[PDB]
Amino acid sequence: MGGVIKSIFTFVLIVEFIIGNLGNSFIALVNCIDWVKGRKISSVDRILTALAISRISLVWLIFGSWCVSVFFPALFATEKMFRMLTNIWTVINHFSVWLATGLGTFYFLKIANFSNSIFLYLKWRVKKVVLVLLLVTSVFLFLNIALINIHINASINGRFSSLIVLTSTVFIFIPFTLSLAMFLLLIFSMWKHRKKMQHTVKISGDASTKAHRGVKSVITFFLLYAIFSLSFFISVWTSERLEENLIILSQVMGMAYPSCHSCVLILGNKKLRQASLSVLLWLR
Numbered sequence: 001m002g003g004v005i006k007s008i009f010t011f012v013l014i015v016e017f018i019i020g021n022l023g024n025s026f027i028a029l030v031n032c033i034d035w036v037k038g039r040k041i042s043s044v045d046r047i048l049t050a051l052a053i054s055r056i057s058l059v060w061l062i063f064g065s066w067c068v069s070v071f072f073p074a075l076f077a078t079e080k081m082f083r084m085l086t087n088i089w090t091v092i093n094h095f096s097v098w099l100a101t102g103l104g105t106f107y108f109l110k111i112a113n114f115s116n117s118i119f120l121y122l123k124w125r126v127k128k129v130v131l132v133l134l135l136v137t138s139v140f141l142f143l144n145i146a147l148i149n150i151h152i153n154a155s156i157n158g159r160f161s162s163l164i165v166l167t168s169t170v171f172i173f174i175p176f177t178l179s180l181a182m183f184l185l186l187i188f189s190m191w192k193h194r195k196k197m198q199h200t201v202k203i204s205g206d207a208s209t210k211a212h213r214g215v216k217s218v219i220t221f222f223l224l225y226a227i228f229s230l231s232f233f234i235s236v237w238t239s240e241r242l243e244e245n246l247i248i249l250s251q252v253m254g255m256a257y258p259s260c261h262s263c264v265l266i267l268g269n270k271k272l273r274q275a276s277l278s279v280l281l282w283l284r
């Protein structure tokens with residue numbers, strides 16, 4: 001039972017390593033080709049290639065951790081490698097997820113339309129706001145590193161993964177909840193605008209270019225939020241309840257976001273979709 005489950009999870013980890021490496025490499029490579037072949041780069045493209053680089057680093061960290069654990073368990077048992085892997089993972093993961101929330105704040109401040117004065121003050125200073133969001137949220141990183149190191153010291157003075165995983169998962173929930181709140185507020189703004197443009201102005205005489213192209217991105221984004229909050233709840237409940245196969249499952253769950261969210265980001269950027277179509281054209 002345990003052996004076939006571990007084999008299935010190993011196959012899952014190999015598949016998601018392949019998908020994540022291919023997707024994030026595709027994002028970074030497309031932006032790099034567009035940069036070297038004399039073309040303009042938007043700010044969204046810079047944030048996207050920052051996410052791609054960070055997610056390549058994170059998926060390589062977890063795959064290298066799995067390679068070290070499988071090939072050299074004696075090396076894996078040491079406290080030095082464990083503490084080094086834990087701290088490097090938490091730094092890279094904090095940077096990656098807060099860059100994703102920064103991209104979400106960029107979308108929300110650029111697109112959404114509200115009458116609040118504070119919202120407009122943030123709305124006309126988007127670059128300053130995302131830079132401040134990256135710099136201020138380092139207090140979360142310092143407190144996370146502190147609490148993980150306290151847990152490591154307590155474990156080696158009493159390896160306590162049942163609290164390490166819980167602390168890390170709590171520290172991923174805050175940017176996820178901020179991104180979900182910004183997404184819901186953007187959807188509410190678009191719905192209010194649609195209700196306004198459906199009763200004063202007779203919609204359009206064309207009715208072609210509108211949110212009818214963005215509903216595909218909204219649908220493929222809300223699907224990812226649903227199927228990832230489900231896996232949030234499943235992983236937290238299973239890690240809390242009784243599991244003793246925690247390492248491979250947690251190594252699988254840590255690679256889920258940087259592998260699937262890049263594929264979601266491909267389906268939803270016009271440049272990335274055009275590059276994917278050109279790749280599928282010249283491959284044939």
Ligand SMILES: CC(C)CCC[C@@H](C)[C@H]1CC[C@H]2[C@@H]3CC=C4C[C@@H](O)CC[C@]4(C)[C@H]3CC[C@]12C
Pocket residue numbers: 062065082085086089161164165166168169172231232235236247250251253254255
């Ligand atoms: C948000 C939730 C569902 C997923 C978050 C992923 C976290 C909990 C996972 C992803 C990679 C994992 C690490 C991968 C490798 C090791 C080495 C081993 O000694 C166990 C602990 C440690 C250090 C793991 C701790 C938990 C970990 C950091």
Ligand SMILES: Cc1cc(C(F)(F)F)nc(Nc2ccccc2-c2nnn[nH]2)n1
Pocket residue numbers: 100101103104105107108179180182183184186214215217218221264265267268269
């Ligand atoms: C692919 C895509 C399309 C759309 C759109 F349909 F609205 F255009 N929106 C998003 N995202 C967000 C929107 C608001 C707040 C946060 C995010 C966010 N969360 N994570 N990354 N960005 N994404």
